[PDB]
Amino acid sequence: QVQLKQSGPGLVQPSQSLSITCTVSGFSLTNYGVHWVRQSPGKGLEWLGVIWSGGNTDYNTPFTSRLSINKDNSKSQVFFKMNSLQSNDTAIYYCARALTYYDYEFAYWGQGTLVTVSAASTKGPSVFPLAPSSKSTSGGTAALGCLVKDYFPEPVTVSWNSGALTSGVHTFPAVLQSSGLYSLSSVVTVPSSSLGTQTYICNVNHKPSNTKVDKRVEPKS
Amino acid sequence: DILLTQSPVILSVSPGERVSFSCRASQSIGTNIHWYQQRTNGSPRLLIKYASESISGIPSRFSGSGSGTDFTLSINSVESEDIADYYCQQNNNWPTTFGAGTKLELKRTVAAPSVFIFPPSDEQLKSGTASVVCLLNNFYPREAKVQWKVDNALQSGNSQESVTEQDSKDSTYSLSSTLTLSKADYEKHKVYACEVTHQGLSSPVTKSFNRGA
Helix, strand or coil: CCEEEECCCEEECCCCCEEEEEEEECCCCCCCCEEEEEEECCCEEEEEEEECCCCCEEECHHHCCCEEEEEEHHHCEEEEEECCCCHHHCEEEEEEEECCCCCCCEEEECCCEEEEECCCCCECCEEEEECCCCCCCECCEEEEEEEEEEEECCCCEEEEHHHCECCCEEECCCEECCCCCEEEEEEEEEEHHHCCCCCCEEEEEEHHHCEEEEEECCCCC | CCCEEEECCEEEECCCCCEEEEEEECCCCCCCEEEEEECCCCCCEEEEECCCEECCCCCCCEEEEEECCEEEEEECCCCHHHCEEEEEEECCCCCCEECCCEEEEECCCCECCEEEEECCCHHHHCCCEEEEEEEEEEEECCCEEEEEEECCEECCCCEEEEECCCCCCCCCEEEEEEEEEEHHHHHCCCEEEEEEEECCCCCCEEEEEECCC
16 A cells, blocks of 8 residues: 655744655665645645655746655655745645656645744643533434633644544534634534443544543533 | 536535536537536545446436536535535546536425534633533524623624534535533633534524533
């Protein structure tokens, strides 16, 4: 299996630099180029550059003076670095490999790295329960969740029962509060008959602040 | 740069129908076009290369055609797993460029939301702020309205909402609305209510609670 795996998301200050690592498996960097593409709401997908098999690089015109791509063939890692960042560089950055060593038919993609460019400081979330009620239980189904409040930057990831509970989960898009901090909620609907015995824990991970929080969500007498 | 223009911005189609996506180039690019699917919070997935050439592991219901400046991606018998954004890419001319995407929405029967209201947790109240959450679950179509009432007074300026992307399993949307008050203000009032209007509801649905009951 060809796989590409990227380093975690993070916050960078305007005028400073970002660094992303792409670790590949299932092929050798000595035989394929690795490309970098970014995606932002408002600029679409944008190809950034490539490091070829033999180490030559090509950088797209907007980036020739502030982009550097190098690699470690022996460890199957590609290093993307971009300088002099401004707000409009906030984006999800992807590495990708083409079908053919010389081509641009991107059959394999990393999972993406959300880089936020802003002068603000990182802040981890507070997590509060959204308890299932009794007057709210609708025909053998109950709703419960977690409120993930006051964090910066995006993203947070939410799972339930460490990934064992996926059915009926809705993790909502974050909203930017006037304070400049994000908030989101994650909910799940479950059998009412289960509420007594089955435990429900939301797992919130905020990598920019190295925050990991588990929150047990319980009925109330 | 070659400009790729994708149309329309959103395509709403019924299950089982054939659907076509348009990608037009600002200059002739031969057949040097590739197509991608991107599901919510996922990475692009190569569907078609060089206008019409198939990709290992992609269902036969995906096909592509066209040349020059006028290109089409087609899905025969669309199904729920096809709910996604679709992008074209050209590489006749350096640098390779991408279109801005077409969103595929799958139509379904009208479904009114199931509505749930959540008081602030005692833990949050310890910190001086009170978030009340209203959940509108699994509704269609996407248009829905939430009105917050505190002691039967319509609220304005103190709520924010978020809507999910269309669920690939049941073709519905869900919506979360949060009313934020200071703890002190929260404790000055009794009845908190979320009032919901939606095409599937002939009258508004209200979910409420009395603080402290």
